[PDB]
Amino acid sequence: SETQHALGTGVFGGMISATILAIFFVPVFFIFILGAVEKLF
Amino acid sequence: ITLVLAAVFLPMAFASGSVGVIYKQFTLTMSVSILFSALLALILTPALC
Amino acid sequence: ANAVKTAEGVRAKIEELKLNLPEGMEFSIPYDTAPFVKISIEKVIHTLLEAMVLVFIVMYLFLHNVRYTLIPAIVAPIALLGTFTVMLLAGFSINVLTM
Amino acid sequence: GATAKTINDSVVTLIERELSGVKNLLYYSATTDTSGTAEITATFKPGTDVEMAQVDVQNKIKAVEARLPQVVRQQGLQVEASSSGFLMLVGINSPNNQYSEVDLSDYLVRNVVEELKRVEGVGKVQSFGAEKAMRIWVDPNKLVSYGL
Amino acid sequence: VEMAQVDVQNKIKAVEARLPQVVRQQGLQVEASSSGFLMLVGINSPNNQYSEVDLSDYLVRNVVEELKRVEGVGKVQSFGAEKAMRIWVDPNKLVSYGLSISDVNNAIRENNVEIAPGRLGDLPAEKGQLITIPLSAQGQLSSLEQFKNISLKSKTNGSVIKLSDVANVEIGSQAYNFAILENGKPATAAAIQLSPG
Amino acid sequence: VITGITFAGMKYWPTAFMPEEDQGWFMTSFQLPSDATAERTRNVVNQFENNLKDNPDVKSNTAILGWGFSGAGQNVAVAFTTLKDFKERTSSASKMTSDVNSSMANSTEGETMAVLPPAIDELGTFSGFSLRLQDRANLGMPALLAAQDELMAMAAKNKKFYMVWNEGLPQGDNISLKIDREKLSALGVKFSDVSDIISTSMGSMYINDFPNQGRMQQVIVQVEAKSRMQLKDILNLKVMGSSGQLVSLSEVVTPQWNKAPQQYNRYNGRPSLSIAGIPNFDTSSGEAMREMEQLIAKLPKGIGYEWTGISLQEKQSESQMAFLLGLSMLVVFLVLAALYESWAIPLSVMLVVPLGIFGAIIAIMSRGLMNDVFFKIGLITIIGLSAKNAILIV
Amino acid sequence: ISTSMGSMYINDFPNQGRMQQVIVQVEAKSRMQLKDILNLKVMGSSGQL
């Protein structure tokens, strides 16, 4: 069980975090990163 | 997506030590399976759909 | 060398040795490591099957149609089958880590 | 015919002196015990082939053969590859005790060991038993009394 | 190089027993060619306080092993001679006592012989033994003086004579054939080779 | 702030190499003092068998008397104990090893230590950490043992170490006869005469081979058992003399008792002693290694240490993880830039990885599993998956 | 002749932990001229050199 547990726990948590947060953060990241270059112009 | 996912595991396969051997198996399996799945998605699934 | 094949061969040879064993003697295998290997690979394969079933269930729930979930589900077996050929060509083997 | 300290002073140090050159070496250790045998172990980088390592070790340990004392050189230095782990243990036991332990060990040694060795994948078979031999126990008092 | 060296090693094994006993005593030294010469380490003594043998024996004991710890250093070859016990027998004095060199050799063999260590309590052991311990003894000469006290038995008078009586005992280079002089003074030299990669 | 907090989450959580596994067997190593005979080892092994007799969770346990890892002699033994299938079993091998250790610590004639199977195929002969204590200043063989004793004394109190021991044969005592040359010379007996009686006093001599049922079998001769037990037999050996009166060794040799190490071990060319230990529960292997490194820092100058076996691989894997992660991130960034013909698009995708890292770290913290190789593989996989969502959007 | 004019190696002895060689030969002063070599004698059957 332990060998499976170690492999599964990290990926489970990471996928949950990168799913729930990403859908809400990626838009902001893209908008502000592109606005940086927009301001530079 | 396929290229990004495949590229990620390549650097770790080249690590040294026993952990490098441990990483080589995962790199091979995951990268080759991902490439095969992308090939299938590009070829077979359009025909089935 | 492989422990599974070696253990199987040793047991097979003991099968022959038993015929000529003088009465009053008894062969024995006090310490064996063969079970745990096959047990581990079989368990990981069972977990593979369970994961396949679970991904099929989630795809069926989201697509709502048997054919729609069938179209992606078939992909995994073919990818794994090609991966096995690539492993054989590359000289690697089947083990718990690969599984 | 030597003590562990003398073995360490004479053979072990000289042998380990030349292990440094071997390609792909990782670490080298040595053990000298009161039993009478000196054992050196050399570990290579993971993934290195054992076959080339063995020949390299043999060739680079020849250098001390002349430097080593006469008895060691004439006896010989044995180079091998051992995993150090047992997967199977076979055995013979007599619940009725009709056949004694010595006879059991002799039967294991005479037939079982070679038959297991011929089975492919059996690198080594350590038999914790001894084949029979003529055993002569001399009484020193009797010999000195008769002058022998 | 490894394949050829192992091949020649295996081939020369056959006649190892057909060479002269004296030749076999020294032992054949097979060695692959050396590529990767870095430098040499030379202990020269301008004051002539030490000779070649002493400098070689200092370098081997203290610096040869010490230098190998350098990362990237593969092997070291020592040019020089290692000390050994020499017994320069006076022939006239041997004639006086009616002894020969063979007698001296036999005395050296007899007096300097190793003793096989044992173990008290070693199995087999009679029931009731609770202690086991190694037991050892020394029978090898180990110093200049003790080698001088090696007993020799005279014939004409039957007296026991030290070995110094009919010989001079010292320590010198095992082989006197070659010599090395740096700036006109004794010297010894160690050469360095790479480790692979 | 999320990135900042996950940074420390990676940095500070303990680390290990491989999860421990229950494989249905364990090893018990019996070590008696250097004065022990076969009977005492047999007695301790019998008591061990007595303890393991009454537990239905054990199939059988085999003991090799006279053989053991890290040394072979009359005072060593190794017992292989195998357990019944998992379903019938109600206790893991760890609990049984703890029970055996406690029972043997209660009353035995020596040190006996129950160890789980090694995790990797051949990385050591047990589970835990192995260390080589070397003498790096030529302090002396006697002083190295004193330093080792100091290390055990200071490490016994530590919580992080369940139990730590020396993996090797202990010190002992030896009788070193001193042969007086001029005594023998005056008495007239040849020195070779006194040498050849000691040589054959208690050693084994081989003569030739005889056929037994058509099989060549050696012929071995040895002084009877009764005559090679105590110092009296060797001390009383009689050799004929020139004067006509037999002279025993007692007159011509001197018995001397000395204390010396029985076994000499070297590691990387420098005298050394092996030490083994088990990481205590609630403490990872890496934490135990760090603690023992700090303990070694306190020993006298000239005593150094090195990690051999699984420990060195663990340290190497810990070291190279940062470079592996950096190279993976750079590769993905370059691939994204190449595929999208822009320099700002990839950065948005890359910034998402910390989000997955916060949640991988959180999960491992919540269950409490120590950082290990599988965690690094999971991190590498989540990098790709988060990049795969960010790509889908961008 | 072999031992007197050629070095004859007998055995090993321990010196400072290293095994060194024991070699027997006639003094260099005597092994100087042909006449001196002829002067070397043998143990006799009757005890006369």
PDB file of N, CA, C and O in Angstrom, chain E residues 62 67 112 134 147 162:
ATOM      1  N   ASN E  62      54.963   6.982   2.442  1.00  0.00           N
ATOM      2  CA  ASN E  62      54.315   8.201   2.909  1.00  0.00           C
ATOM      3  C   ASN E  62      53.656   9.013   1.804  1.00  0.00           C
ATOM      4  O   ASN E  62      52.658   9.692   2.069  1.00  0.00           O
ATOM      5  N   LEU E  67      49.557  10.606  -2.477  1.00  0.00           N
ATOM      6  CA  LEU E  67      49.257  11.330  -3.709  1.00  0.00           C
ATOM      7  C   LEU E  67      48.075  10.745  -4.471  1.00  0.00           C
ATOM      8  O   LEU E  67      47.380  11.490  -5.170  1.00  0.00           O
ATOM      9  N   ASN E 112      64.266 -18.662  10.400  1.00  0.00           N
ATOM     10  CA  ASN E 112      63.199 -17.755   9.983  1.00  0.00           C
ATOM     11  C   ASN E 112      62.124 -18.583   9.287  1.00  0.00           C
ATOM     12  O   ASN E 112      62.141 -18.743   8.064  1.00  0.00           O
ATOM     13  N   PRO E 134      41.947 -16.991  19.809  1.00  0.00           N
ATOM     14  CA  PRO E 134      43.077 -17.259  18.909  1.00  0.00           C
ATOM     15  C   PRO E 134      44.390 -17.332  19.676  1.00  0.00           C
ATOM     16  O   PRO E 134      44.617 -16.584  20.629  1.00  0.00           O
ATOM     17  N   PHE E 147      68.594 -10.782  13.102  1.00  0.00           N
ATOM     18  CA  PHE E 147      69.196 -11.521  11.964  1.00  0.00           C
ATOM     19  C   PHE E 147      70.679 -11.753  12.276  1.00  0.00           C
ATOM     20  O   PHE E 147      71.170 -12.834  11.922  1.00  0.00           O
ATOM     21  N   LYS E 162      77.400 -16.503  15.991  1.00  0.00           N
ATOM     22  CA  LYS E 162      76.378 -15.629  15.388  1.00  0.00           C
ATOM     23  C   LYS E 162      76.611 -15.669  13.882  1.00  0.00           C
ATOM     24  O   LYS E 162      77.652 -16.212  13.483  1.00  0.00           O
TER      25      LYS E 162
END
